[PDB]
PDB file of C-alpha atoms in Angstrom:
ATOM      1  CA  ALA A   1     119.399  19.870  44.293  1.00 21.82           C
ATOM      2  CA  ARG A   2     117.842  19.869  41.445  1.00 17.71           C
ATOM      3  CA  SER A   3     114.489  19.070  42.144  1.00 17.35           C
ATOM      4  CA  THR A   4     112.925  19.314  45.910  1.00 18.08           C
ATOM      5  CA  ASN A   5     112.360  15.258  45.913  1.00 20.18           C
ATOM      6  CA  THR A   6     116.424  15.422  45.851  1.00 19.62           C
ATOM      7  CA  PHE A   7     116.827  17.884  49.007  1.00 19.66           C
ATOM      8  CA  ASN A   8     118.420  16.638  51.773  1.00 18.35           C
ATOM      9  CA  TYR A   9     115.486  17.236  54.197  1.00 21.64           C
ATOM     10  CA  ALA A  10     117.843  15.269  56.986  1.00 19.44           C
ATOM     11  CA  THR A  11     120.721  17.841  57.056  1.00 18.83           C
ATOM     12  CA  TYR A  12     121.220  21.666  57.909  1.00 19.41           C
ATOM     13  CA  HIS A  13     121.547  24.449  55.369  1.00 19.47           C
ATOM     14  CA  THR A  14     122.904  27.747  54.400  1.00 19.62           C
ATOM     15  CA  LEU A  15     120.691  30.614  53.459  1.00 18.92           C
ATOM     16  CA  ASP A  16     121.243  30.380  49.863  1.00 19.05           C
ATOM     17  CA  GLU A  17     120.361  26.337  49.587  1.00 21.86           C
ATOM     18  CA  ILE A  18     116.914  27.508  51.619  1.00 20.74           C
ATOM     19  CA  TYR A  19     116.642  30.210  48.991  1.00 21.40           C
ATOM     20  CA  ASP A  20     117.326  28.161  45.673  1.00 20.10           C
ATOM     21  CA  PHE A  21     114.869  25.209  47.433  1.00 22.42           C
ATOM     22  CA  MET A  22     111.895  28.157  47.907  1.00 22.05           C
ATOM     23  CA  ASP A  23     112.415  28.766  43.768  1.00 21.79           C
ATOM     24  CA  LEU A  24     112.292  25.085  43.289  1.00 21.24           C
ATOM     25  CA  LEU A  25     109.361  24.016  44.817  1.00 19.76           C
ATOM     26  CA  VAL A  26     107.555  27.274  42.929  1.00 17.73           C
ATOM     27  CA  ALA A  27     108.147  26.157  39.934  1.00 17.74           C
ATOM     28  CA  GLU A  28     106.975  22.526  40.878  1.00 17.75           C
ATOM     29  CA  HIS A  29     103.523  23.938  42.357  1.00 15.95           C
ATOM     30  CA  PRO A  30     103.343  27.338  40.365  1.00 14.48           C
ATOM     31  CA  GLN A  31      99.238  26.686  41.226  1.00 13.12           C
ATOM     32  CA  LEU A  32      99.824  26.280  45.124  1.00 12.41           C
ATOM     33  CA  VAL A  33     102.705  28.418  46.165  1.00 10.85           C
ATOM     34  CA  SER A  34     104.092  31.140  45.764  1.00 10.24           C
ATOM     35  CA  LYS A  35     107.503  33.308  46.707  1.00 10.37           C
ATOM     36  CA  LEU A  36     106.057  37.226  48.280  1.00 12.57           C
ATOM     37  CA  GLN A  37     109.317  39.510  49.405  1.00 12.60           C
ATOM     38  CA  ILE A  38     108.058  41.803  51.930  1.00 12.28           C
ATOM     39  CA  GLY A  39     111.153  43.593  52.725  1.00  8.43           C
ATOM     40  CA  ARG A  40     115.201  43.766  53.071  1.00 10.70           C
ATOM     41  CA  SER A  41     117.640  42.682  56.126  1.00  8.85           C
ATOM     42  CA  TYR A  42     119.566  45.255  57.663  1.00  9.49           C
ATOM     43  CA  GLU A  43     122.447  44.116  55.617  1.00 13.18           C
ATOM     44  CA  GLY A  44     119.929  43.997  52.577  1.00 14.41           C
ATOM     45  CA  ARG A  45     119.018  40.557  52.232  1.00 15.60           C
ATOM     46  CA  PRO A  46     115.728  40.029  50.832  1.00 10.73           C
ATOM     47  CA  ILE A  47     113.132  38.708  53.561  1.00 12.52           C
ATOM     48  CA  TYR A  48     110.887  35.558  51.683  1.00 13.91           C
ATOM     49  CA  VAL A  49     107.855  34.295  52.792  1.00 15.12           C
ATOM     50  CA  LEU A  50     105.578  31.374  50.780  1.00 14.60           C
ATOM     51  CA  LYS A  51     102.006  31.953  50.240  1.00 16.23           C
ATOM     52  CA  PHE A  52     100.207  28.100  50.086  1.00 14.22           C
ATOM     53  CA  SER A  53      96.738  28.582  48.724  1.00 13.90           C
ATOM     54  CA  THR A  54      94.386  26.920  46.340  1.00 20.27           C
ATOM     55  CA  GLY A  55      92.752  31.005  45.409  1.00 20.43           C
ATOM     56  CA  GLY A  56      89.937  33.095  46.571  1.00 21.46           C
ATOM     57  CA  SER A  57      90.599  36.686  47.752  1.00 21.94           C
ATOM     58  CA  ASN A  58      92.601  37.405  51.405  1.00 20.45           C
ATOM     59  CA  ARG A  59      90.851  34.189  52.568  1.00 20.16           C
ATOM     60  CA  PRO A  60      91.328  33.736  56.145  1.00 18.85           C
ATOM     61  CA  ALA A  61      95.079  33.026  56.747  1.00 17.28           C
ATOM     62  CA  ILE A  62      97.440  31.130  59.114  1.00 15.34           C
ATOM     63  CA  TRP A  63     101.275  32.875  59.726  1.00 19.69           C
ATOM     64  CA  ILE A  64     103.838  30.617  60.861  1.00 19.37           C
ATOM     65  CA  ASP A  65     107.559  32.288  61.387  1.00 18.86           C
ATOM     66  CA  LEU A  66     110.244  30.619  62.145  1.00 24.08           C
ATOM     67  CA  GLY A  67     113.920  31.270  63.070  1.00 22.89           C
ATOM     68  CA  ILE A  68     113.581  34.772  64.350  1.00 23.64           C
ATOM     69  CA  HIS A  69     116.882  33.470  66.527  1.00 23.55           C
ATOM     70  CA  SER A  70     119.200  32.535  64.130  1.00 21.53           C
ATOM     71  CA  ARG A  71     120.937  29.917  66.210  1.00 24.64           C
ATOM     72  CA  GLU A  72     118.283  27.816  66.386  1.00 22.95           C
ATOM     73  CA  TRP A  73     119.253  25.825  63.310  1.00 27.68           C
ATOM     74  CA  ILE A  74     116.138  22.850  64.156  1.00 26.61           C
ATOM     75  CA  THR A  75     113.383  25.952  63.005  1.00 25.14           C
ATOM     76  CA  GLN A  76     114.707  27.149  59.830  1.00 22.36           C
ATOM     77  CA  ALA A  77     115.413  22.665  59.453  1.00 22.42           C
ATOM     78  CA  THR A  78     111.241  22.410  59.927  1.00 20.24           C
ATOM     79  CA  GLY A  79     110.403  24.930  58.023  1.00 21.45           C
ATOM     80  CA  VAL A  80     111.902  23.734  55.283  1.00 22.10           C
ATOM     81  CA  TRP A  81     109.898  20.264  56.034  1.00 19.43           C
ATOM     82  CA  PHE A  82     106.910  21.723  56.612  1.00 17.00           C
ATOM     83  CA  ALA A  83     106.767  23.641  53.275  1.00 15.64           C
ATOM     84  CA  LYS A  84     108.084  20.104  51.230  1.00 14.65           C
ATOM     85  CA  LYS A  85     104.974  18.925  52.991  1.00 15.52           C
ATOM     86  CA  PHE A  86     102.033  20.926  52.610  1.00 16.12           C
ATOM     87  CA  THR A  87     103.105  20.210  48.924  1.00 16.19           C
ATOM     88  CA  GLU A  88     102.834  16.081  49.604  1.00 15.10           C
ATOM     89  CA  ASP A  89      99.682  16.077  51.634  1.00 14.35           C
ATOM     90  CA  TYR A  90      97.269  18.703  49.670  1.00 10.75           C
ATOM     91  CA  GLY A  91      94.660  15.952  47.954  1.00 16.82           C
ATOM     92  CA  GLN A  92      96.343  12.898  49.756  1.00 13.51           C
ATOM     93  CA  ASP A  93      95.162  14.297  53.399  1.00 13.46           C
ATOM     94  CA  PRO A  94      91.951  14.612  54.422  1.00 15.12           C
ATOM     95  CA  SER A  95      92.087  17.042  56.702  1.00 16.05           C
ATOM     96  CA  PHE A  96      94.293  19.414  55.770  1.00 15.15           C
ATOM     97  CA  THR A  97      92.764  19.418  52.068  1.00 17.37           C
ATOM     98  CA  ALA A  98      89.638  20.212  54.213  1.00 15.42           C
ATOM     99  CA  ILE A  99      92.230  24.043  55.431  1.00 11.32           C
ATOM    100  CA  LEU A 100      93.652  24.252  52.450  1.00  8.83           C
ATOM    101  CA  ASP A 101      90.410  24.450  50.316  1.00 11.97           C
ATOM    102  CA  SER A 102      89.636  27.623  52.694  1.00 11.12           C
ATOM    103  CA  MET A 103      92.404  28.855  54.640  1.00 10.64           C
ATOM    104  CA  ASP A 104      96.306  30.203  53.048  1.00 12.07           C
ATOM    105  CA  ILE A 105      99.459  29.816  55.016  1.00 12.78           C
ATOM    106  CA  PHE A 106     101.819  32.047  55.059  1.00 14.24           C
ATOM    107  CA  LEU A 107     105.691  30.366  55.743  1.00 15.20           C
ATOM    108  CA  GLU A 108     108.686  32.716  57.026  1.00 14.92           C
ATOM    109  CA  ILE A 109     111.230  29.541  57.003  1.00 14.74           C
ATOM    110  CA  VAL A 110     113.772  32.297  57.807  1.00 11.18           C
ATOM    111  CA  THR A 111     112.943  35.943  59.332  1.00 12.99           C
ATOM    112  CA  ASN A 112     116.310  36.854  60.387  1.00 12.01           C
ATOM    113  CA  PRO A 113     118.295  36.478  57.251  1.00 12.71           C
ATOM    114  CA  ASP A 114     121.510  38.030  58.743  1.00 13.34           C
ATOM    115  CA  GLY A 115     121.759  36.707  61.603  1.00 17.89           C
ATOM    116  CA  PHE A 116     121.379  33.103  60.115  1.00 18.47           C
ATOM    117  CA  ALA A 117     123.896  33.993  57.422  1.00 22.20           C
ATOM    118  CA  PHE A 118     126.501  34.691  60.600  1.00 20.12           C
ATOM    119  CA  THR A 119     125.484  31.470  62.523  1.00 19.05           C
ATOM    120  CA  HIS A 120     127.210  29.368  59.471  1.00 19.73           C
ATOM    121  CA  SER A 121     130.069  32.402  58.769  1.00 16.84           C
ATOM    122  CA  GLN A 122     131.837  33.660  62.356  1.00 13.73           C
ATOM    123  CA  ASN A 123     129.441  32.370  65.017  1.00 11.31           C
ATOM    124  CA  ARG A 124     126.775  29.123  65.384  1.00 13.29           C
ATOM    125  CA  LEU A 125     125.769  30.596  68.307  1.00 12.28           C
ATOM    126  CA  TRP A 126     124.516  34.009  66.929  1.00 11.32           C
ATOM    127  CA  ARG A 127     120.881  34.826  67.780  1.00  9.74           C
ATOM    128  CA  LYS A 128     120.207  38.966  67.309  1.00 10.51           C
ATOM    129  CA  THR A 129     119.603  40.415  63.912  1.00 12.38           C
ATOM    130  CA  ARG A 130     123.101  41.880  62.645  1.00 10.87           C
ATOM    131  CA  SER A 131     121.957  45.483  62.785  1.00  8.89           C
ATOM    132  CA  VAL A 132     124.568  48.386  64.449  1.00  9.14           C
ATOM    133  CA  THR A 133     123.662  51.707  66.280  1.00  8.85           C
ATOM    134  CA  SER A 134     126.940  54.245  67.462  1.00  7.57           C
ATOM    135  CA  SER A 135     126.302  54.167  70.566  1.00  6.14           C
ATOM    136  CA  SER A 136     127.610  51.126  70.610  1.00  5.78           C
ATOM    137  CA  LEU A 137     130.721  48.593  69.582  1.00  5.45           C
ATOM    138  CA  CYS A 138     127.769  45.483  69.710  1.00  2.61           C
ATOM    139  CA  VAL A 139     126.033  44.408  67.191  1.00  2.00           C
ATOM    140  CA  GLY A 140     122.370  43.614  67.295  1.00  2.00           C
ATOM    141  CA  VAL A 141     119.021  43.270  68.720  1.00  2.00           C
ATOM    142  CA  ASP A 142     116.901  40.449  69.842  1.00  2.00           C
ATOM    143  CA  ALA A 143     114.012  40.143  67.500  1.00  2.00           C
ATOM    144  CA  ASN A 144     111.420  38.779  70.036  1.00  2.00           C
ATOM    145  CA  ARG A 145     111.750  41.376  72.379  1.00  2.00           C
ATOM    146  CA  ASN A 146     111.536  44.642  69.585  1.00  2.00           C
ATOM    147  CA  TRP A 147     107.616  43.732  69.106  1.00  2.00           C
ATOM    148  CA  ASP A 148     105.007  46.840  70.250  1.00  2.00           C
ATOM    149  CA  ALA A 149     103.229  44.897  73.184  1.00  2.00           C
ATOM    150  CA  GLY A 150     104.983  45.602  76.450  1.00  2.00           C
ATOM    151  CA  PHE A 151     108.237  47.091  75.097  1.00  2.00           C
ATOM    152  CA  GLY A 152     110.699  48.035  77.175  1.00  2.00           C
ATOM    153  CA  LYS A 153     109.062  46.225  80.309  1.00  2.00           C
ATOM    154  CA  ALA A 154     110.900  43.762  82.625  1.00  2.00           C
ATOM    155  CA  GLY A 155     111.545  40.954  80.956  1.00  2.00           C
ATOM    156  CA  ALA A 156     114.019  42.362  78.079  1.00  2.00           C
ATOM    157  CA  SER A 157     117.034  44.491  78.426  1.00  2.00           C
ATOM    158  CA  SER A 158     118.427  48.672  77.101  1.00  2.00           C
ATOM    159  CA  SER A 159     121.955  47.530  77.274  1.00  2.00           C
ATOM    160  CA  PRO A 160     122.365  46.842  73.450  1.00  2.00           C
ATOM    161  CA  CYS A 161     125.428  43.840  74.076  1.00  2.00           C
ATOM    162  CA  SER A 162     123.014  42.213  75.945  1.00  2.00           C
ATOM    163  CA  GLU A 163     121.360  38.812  74.536  1.00  2.00           C
ATOM    164  CA  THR A 164     118.236  40.204  74.922  1.00  2.00           C
ATOM    165  CA  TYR A 165     118.715  43.769  73.786  1.00  2.00           C
ATOM    166  CA  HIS A 166     115.258  44.501  72.636  1.00  2.00           C
ATOM    167  CA  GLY A 167     116.385  47.480  70.265  1.00  2.00           C
ATOM    168  CA  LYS A 168     116.015  51.562  70.336  1.00  2.00           C
ATOM    169  CA  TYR A 169     111.926  51.342  69.938  1.00  2.00           C
ATOM    170  CA  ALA A 170     109.405  49.069  69.170  1.00  2.00           C
ATOM    171  CA  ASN A 171     109.273  47.378  65.242  1.00  2.00           C
ATOM    172  CA  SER A 172     112.751  49.256  64.761  1.00  2.00           C
ATOM    173  CA  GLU A 173     114.469  46.137  63.412  1.00  2.00           C
ATOM    174  CA  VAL A 174     113.471  45.697  59.309  1.00  2.00           C
ATOM    175  CA  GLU A 175     112.422  42.021  59.885  1.00  2.00           C
ATOM    176  CA  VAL A 176     110.398  42.869  62.769  1.00  2.00           C
ATOM    177  CA  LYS A 177     108.727  45.886  61.188  1.00  2.00           C
ATOM    178  CA  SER A 178     107.938  43.936  57.428  1.00  2.00           C
ATOM    179  CA  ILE A 179     106.438  41.658  59.145  1.00  2.00           C
ATOM    180  CA  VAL A 180     104.287  43.615  61.317  1.00  2.00           C
ATOM    181  CA  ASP A 181     103.216  45.890  58.282  1.00  2.00           C
ATOM    182  CA  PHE A 182     102.695  42.500  56.116  1.00  2.00           C
ATOM    183  CA  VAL A 183     100.356  41.563  58.834  1.00  2.00           C
ATOM    184  CA  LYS A 184      98.607  44.133  59.710  1.00  2.00           C
ATOM    185  CA  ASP A 185      98.126  45.788  56.061  1.00  2.00           C
ATOM    186  CA  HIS A 186      96.288  41.414  55.280  1.00  2.00           C
ATOM    187  CA  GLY A 187      94.022  42.342  57.838  1.00  2.00           C
ATOM    188  CA  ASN A 188      92.548  38.910  58.325  1.00  2.00           C
ATOM    189  CA  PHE A 189      94.768  36.377  59.974  1.00  2.00           C
ATOM    190  CA  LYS A 190      93.613  33.660  62.342  1.00  2.00           C
ATOM    191  CA  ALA A 191      96.527  32.220  63.250  1.00  2.00           C
ATOM    192  CA  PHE A 192     100.114  33.591  64.384  1.00  2.00           C
ATOM    193  CA  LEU A 193     102.726  30.417  65.188  1.00  2.00           C
ATOM    194  CA  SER A 194     106.235  31.241  65.744  1.00  2.00           C
ATOM    195  CA  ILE A 195     108.328  28.562  66.152  1.00  2.00           C
ATOM    196  CA  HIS A 196     111.631  28.394  68.592  1.00  2.00           C
ATOM    197  CA  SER A 197     113.974  25.738  69.929  1.00  2.00           C
ATOM    198  CA  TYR A 198     114.836  24.471  72.615  1.00  2.00           C
ATOM    199  CA  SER A 199     112.943  23.376  75.675  1.00  2.00           C
ATOM    200  CA  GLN A 200     110.025  21.052  74.322  1.00  2.00           C
ATOM    201  CA  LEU A 201     107.591  23.927  75.270  1.00  2.00           C
ATOM    202  CA  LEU A 202     103.538  25.075  73.720  1.00  2.00           C
ATOM    203  CA  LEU A 203     102.969  28.148  75.001  1.00  2.00           C
ATOM    204  CA  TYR A 204     100.600  31.132  74.480  1.00  2.00           C
ATOM    205  CA  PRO A 205      99.624  34.720  75.720  1.00  2.00           C
ATOM    206  CA  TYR A 206     101.129  36.342  77.424  1.00  2.00           C
ATOM    207  CA  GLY A 207     104.879  36.743  78.829  1.00  2.00           C
ATOM    208  CA  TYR A 208     105.203  40.714  79.686  1.00  2.00           C
ATOM    209  CA  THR A 209     101.594  40.821  82.083  1.00  2.00           C
ATOM    210  CA  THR A 210     100.498  38.807  84.409  1.00  2.00           C
ATOM    211  CA  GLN A 211      97.017  39.626  83.415  1.00  2.00           C
ATOM    212  CA  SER A 212      94.986  36.205  81.975  1.00  2.00           C
ATOM    213  CA  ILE A 213      94.119  36.125  78.395  1.00  2.00           C
ATOM    214  CA  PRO A 214      89.913  36.578  78.148  1.00  2.00           C
ATOM    215  CA  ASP A 215      90.192  33.723  75.776  1.00  2.00           C
ATOM    216  CA  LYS A 216      92.713  31.089  77.849  1.00  2.00           C
ATOM    217  CA  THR A 217      90.252  28.344  78.280  1.00  2.00           C
ATOM    218  CA  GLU A 218      90.407  27.267  74.723  1.00  2.00           C
ATOM    219  CA  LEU A 219      93.890  28.571  74.546  1.00  2.00           C
ATOM    220  CA  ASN A 220      94.902  25.917  77.036  1.00  2.00           C
ATOM    221  CA  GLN A 221      92.683  22.865  75.833  1.00  2.00           C
ATOM    222  CA  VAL A 222      94.080  23.434  72.412  1.00  2.00           C
ATOM    223  CA  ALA A 223      97.200  23.226  73.342  1.00  2.00           C
ATOM    224  CA  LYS A 224      96.529  20.359  75.368  1.00  2.00           C
ATOM    225  CA  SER A 225      94.856  18.613  72.244  1.00  2.00           C
ATOM    226  CA  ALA A 226      98.705  19.393  69.936  1.00  2.00           C
ATOM    227  CA  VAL A 227     100.584  18.219  72.685  1.00  2.00           C
ATOM    228  CA  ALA A 228      98.967  14.966  73.047  1.00  2.00           C
ATOM    229  CA  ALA A 229      99.065  14.880  68.881  1.00  2.00           C
ATOM    230  CA  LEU A 230     102.885  15.872  68.816  1.00  2.00           C
ATOM    231  CA  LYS A 231     103.738  12.958  71.332  1.00  2.00           C
ATOM    232  CA  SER A 232     102.130  10.718  69.582  1.00  2.00           C
ATOM    233  CA  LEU A 233     104.641   9.906  67.189  1.00  2.00           C
ATOM    234  CA  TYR A 234     108.112   9.523  69.479  1.00  2.00           C
ATOM    235  CA  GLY A 235     106.810   9.357  73.079  1.00  2.00           C
ATOM    236  CA  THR A 236     108.113  12.924  73.346  1.00  2.00           C
ATOM    237  CA  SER A 237     106.690  15.147  76.302  1.00  2.00           C
ATOM    238  CA  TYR A 238     105.748  19.016  75.745  1.00  2.00           C
ATOM    239  CA  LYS A 239     104.721  21.648  78.583  1.00  2.00           C
ATOM    240  CA  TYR A 240     102.404  24.068  78.027  1.00  2.00           C
ATOM    241  CA  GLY A 241     100.981  27.533  79.290  1.00  2.00           C
ATOM    242  CA  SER A 242     100.915  31.163  79.227  1.00  2.00           C
ATOM    243  CA  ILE A 243     104.452  32.619  78.929  1.00  2.00           C
ATOM    244  CA  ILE A 244     105.055  34.513  82.019  1.00  2.00           C
ATOM    245  CA  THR A 245     103.783  31.271  84.101  1.00  2.00           C
ATOM    246  CA  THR A 246     105.622  28.472  82.202  1.00  2.00           C
ATOM    247  CA  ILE A 247     109.269  30.394  82.084  1.00  2.00           C
ATOM    248  CA  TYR A 248     109.314  33.530  82.722  1.00  2.00           C
ATOM    249  CA  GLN A 249     108.356  37.564  81.993  1.00  2.00           C
ATOM    250  CA  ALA A 250     109.730  38.392  78.673  1.00  2.00           C
ATOM    251  CA  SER A 251     108.660  41.713  77.257  1.00  2.00           C
ATOM    252  CA  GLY A 252     108.317  42.796  73.487  1.00  2.00           C
ATOM    253  CA  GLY A 253     106.526  39.426  71.994  1.00  2.00           C
ATOM    254  CA  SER A 254     105.305  38.273  68.924  1.00  2.00           C
ATOM    255  CA  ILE A 255     102.679  36.332  70.402  1.00  2.00           C
ATOM    256  CA  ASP A 256     101.710  38.923  72.737  1.00  2.00           C
ATOM    257  CA  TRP A 257     102.246  41.522  69.527  1.00  2.00           C
ATOM    258  CA  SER A 258      99.669  39.038  67.559  1.00  2.00           C
ATOM    259  CA  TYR A 259      96.814  38.360  70.036  1.00  2.00           C
ATOM    260  CA  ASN A 260      96.633  41.906  70.919  1.00  2.00           C
ATOM    261  CA  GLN A 261      96.091  42.659  66.896  1.00  2.00           C
ATOM    262  CA  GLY A 262      93.523  40.651  67.274  1.00  2.00           C
ATOM    263  CA  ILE A 263      94.426  36.870  65.921  1.00  2.00           C
ATOM    264  CA  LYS A 264      93.309  34.682  68.622  1.00  2.00           C
ATOM    265  CA  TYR A 265      95.494  31.699  68.221  1.00  2.00           C
ATOM    266  CA  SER A 266      98.484  32.707  68.739  1.00  2.00           C
ATOM    267  CA  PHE A 267     101.208  29.787  69.849  1.00  2.00           C
ATOM    268  CA  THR A 268     105.391  30.021  70.413  1.00  2.00           C
ATOM    269  CA  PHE A 269     106.652  26.176  69.778  1.00  2.00           C
ATOM    270  CA  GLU A 270     109.738  25.382  71.463  1.00  2.00           C
ATOM    271  CA  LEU A 271     110.854  22.628  69.399  1.00  2.00           C
ATOM    272  CA  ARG A 272     113.407  19.391  70.673  1.00  2.00           C
ATOM    273  CA  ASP A 273     115.663  19.013  72.605  1.00  2.00           C
ATOM    274  CA  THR A 274     115.620  19.722  76.478  1.00  2.00           C
ATOM    275  CA  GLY A 275     119.869  19.952  76.667  1.00  2.00           C
ATOM    276  CA  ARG A 276     121.102  16.874  75.882  1.00  2.00           C
ATOM    277  CA  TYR A 277     122.226  19.161  72.560  1.00  2.00           C
ATOM    278  CA  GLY A 278     120.436  22.345  73.006  1.00  2.00           C
ATOM    279  CA  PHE A 279     120.622  24.652  69.790  1.00  2.00           C
ATOM    280  CA  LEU A 280     123.565  21.550  68.579  1.00  2.00           C
ATOM    281  CA  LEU A 281     120.502  19.589  68.256  1.00  2.00           C
ATOM    282  CA  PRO A 282     121.628  16.203  66.037  1.00  2.00           C
ATOM    283  CA  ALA A 283     121.289  16.327  62.143  1.00  2.00           C
ATOM    284  CA  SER A 284     119.515  13.068  62.047  1.00  2.00           C
ATOM    285  CA  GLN A 285     116.775  13.843  64.820  1.00  2.00           C
ATOM    286  CA  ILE A 286     116.064  16.596  62.222  1.00  2.00           C
ATOM    287  CA  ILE A 287     113.061  14.430  60.449  1.00  2.00           C
ATOM    288  CA  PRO A 288     111.300  13.056  63.416  1.00  2.00           C
ATOM    289  CA  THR A 289     110.719  16.852  64.768  1.00  2.00           C
ATOM    290  CA  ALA A 290     109.531  17.865  61.768  1.00  2.00           C
ATOM    291  CA  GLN A 291     107.289  15.208  61.555  1.00  2.00           C
ATOM    292  CA  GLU A 292     105.951  15.545  65.250  1.00  2.00           C
ATOM    293  CA  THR A 293     105.783  19.464  65.145  1.00  2.00           C
ATOM    294  CA  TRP A 294     103.704  18.940  61.378  1.00  2.00           C
ATOM    295  CA  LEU A 295     100.980  17.221  64.280  1.00  2.00           C
ATOM    296  CA  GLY A 296     101.267  19.716  66.527  1.00  2.00           C
ATOM    297  CA  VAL A 297     100.599  22.171  64.250  1.00  2.00           C
ATOM    298  CA  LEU A 298      98.022  20.620  62.541  1.00  2.00           C
ATOM    299  CA  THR A 299      95.732  20.565  65.310  1.00  2.00           C
ATOM    300  CA  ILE A 300      95.850  23.872  65.243  1.00  2.00           C
ATOM    301  CA  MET A 301      95.174  24.563  61.865  1.00  2.00           C
ATOM    302  CA  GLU A 302      92.501  22.509  62.573  1.00  2.00           C
ATOM    303  CA  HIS A 303      90.764  24.157  65.700  1.00  2.00           C
ATOM    304  CA  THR A 304      90.888  27.669  63.223  1.00  2.00           C
ATOM    305  CA  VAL A 305      88.999  26.470  60.368  1.00  2.00           C
TER     306      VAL A 305
END
């Protein structure tokens, strides 16, 4: 509300409230947080990224995006909690402090603004973007199947009306291209994490191919460690492994793209729960979900630094 200290972290918010939150956080911690606009959505909404940094020039960075699939509300809520957490733990938590003293963190809380606004206004379960094409009456593209990584291959639909439609061509969605352009221009990201829900899974590349990544041993142990850390708070059990062997083949995914760009620590989190509530996770589970997920994300960050 008037302060990030009065903001209700235990309830779901609208796009405007989340955008207001960002400005409050920056005004309160001008020396640590800055708000960057990396593009505009299909419907003209600004796409914001929060940069957490103690200084330096183009220091090694960590990318974290949430809400690429709009109906996965627990992600945007966790993103807001993360933003506040970073400001409270710097200078308090020895490990997190060391990380921020040497690396920058870029956080995109609402990766798909138009879809998010739509889930509040018309369809709570909408997941795609809101782009339109003359070739069909259906709207939107599955932003996590629109990346240039096995684009168009099995594990995505070529039908505009499909919930997993990949789009006319790779990076056709401005919400995706905005991230691609930013990360390529930056050129110094070491980790790339994309947050989703639900299933309680921690996955690494690849999803579009059966080929094993050359860093499988390391990423597999990092995942095992992150999952153990996350489970330590409430006993929440996660499974981990490559996308294709844990779930199924899926093309045009973001971490497959990032890994091919040379960003070794690329992981995807699928948060609570396992189906009881699914995408409609109770607000009472926001904080405990964010708390445990933080332990997992920090573990990965520690291995990155």
